[PDB]
Amino acid sequence: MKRTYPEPTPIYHITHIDNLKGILRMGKLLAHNQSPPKQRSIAYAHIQERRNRAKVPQPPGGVLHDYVPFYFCPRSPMLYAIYSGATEYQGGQEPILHLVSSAQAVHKAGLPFVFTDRHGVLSHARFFRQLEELAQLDWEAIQASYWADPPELREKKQAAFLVYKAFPWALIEEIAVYSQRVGEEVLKILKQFPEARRPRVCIRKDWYY
DNA sequence: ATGTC
Ligand SMILES: NC(=O)c1cccnc1
């Protein structure tokens, strides 16, 4: 019998540790089109250019770059490309944070969101607004440790949770890290912003390659 | 195993 979604339903945003000061200084993740003060890009430029022009067909509309992106799993295919040094970024996985929240927290906060059933740049991706439609996602695919094939599993592992324009730091519940050295550095950065929520910092080597 | 398509 096919797996269901946990409730609350965790959502994950990966970013380089060099960006955490900018996230705390703004008090939020900003969408790409909101010009976040990022220090370190870990993206593929050629797929960023697709996101730059990919329409979001549910309200509040706009394009994929108008939304702060999350996945429904850690240990993403994106993180594999970073781990293997396939990106322009050559620093590897160790300085990449997993920022964790939930779908339900976003809804309760009244923030506009959409989600997809597969990688959002695919022309056949379905888009949803109602958390009951989390039943449309493939939770086997989302949880799969081996995702390279078959193709439908590879697409559906990359179902995305999309928050319009900005995501408030106070909705982050956990920062997951690869190593003790990165966890310590995360805590030093948080202590420079004493008015900000300090989520638990957890070493989760099984969220990495 | 997996170099986001
Ligand atoms: N940076 C990310 O975690 C992310 C999540 C979903 C899609 N693209 C990027």
Residue whose CA is at the smallest distance from ligand 1 atom 7:
A69
Residue A99 lies in a domain: yes
Indicate the number of domains in chain A: 1
Nucleic chain B contacts, protein chain A, residues 85-114, CB cut-off 7 A: 86-87
Atom of ligand 1 at shortest range from CA of A70: 5
Residue A3 lies in a domain: no
Residue whose CA is at the smallest distance from ligand 1 atom 8:
A69
Report the number of secondary-structure helices (H) and strands (E) in chain A: 7, 10
Tokens of A196: 């900000």
Residue A1 lies in a domain: no
Write phi, then psi, for A80 (nearest 5 degrees): -60, -45
Residue A182 lies in a domain: yes
In whole angstroms, what is the distance from residue A58 CA to residue A177 CA?
33
Closest protein CA to C1' of nucleotide B3, residue: A81
State the residue range of the domain holding A132. Answer: 10-207
Give Cα separations from A167 to A37, A79, A83, A86, A108 (angstroms). Answer: 14, 21, 26, 28, 13
Nearest nucleotide, C1' to the C-alpha of A149? B2
**Method in brief:** X-ray
Tokens of A168: 């408030």
Atom of ligand 1 at shortest range from CA of A14: 3
Residue A148 lies in a domain: yes
**H-type helices in A5-102, by residue range?**
20-26, 45-51, 77-83
Answer left, alpha or beta for residue A191, where phi above 0 means left and psi between -120 and 50 means alpha: alpha
Q: What was the resolution (in A) of this experimentally determined structure?
A: 1.7
Residue whose CA is at the smallest distance from ligand 1 atom 5:
A70
Q: Which of A99, A89, A97 is nearest to A40 (CA)?
A: A89
Nearest nucleotide, C1' to the C-alpha of A44? B4
Residue A199 lies in a domain: yes
Residue A95 lies in a domain: yes
Residue A2 lies in a domain: no
Residues in chain A: 209
Closest protein CA to C1' of nucleotide B4, residue: A78
3-state SS assignment for residue A181 = helix
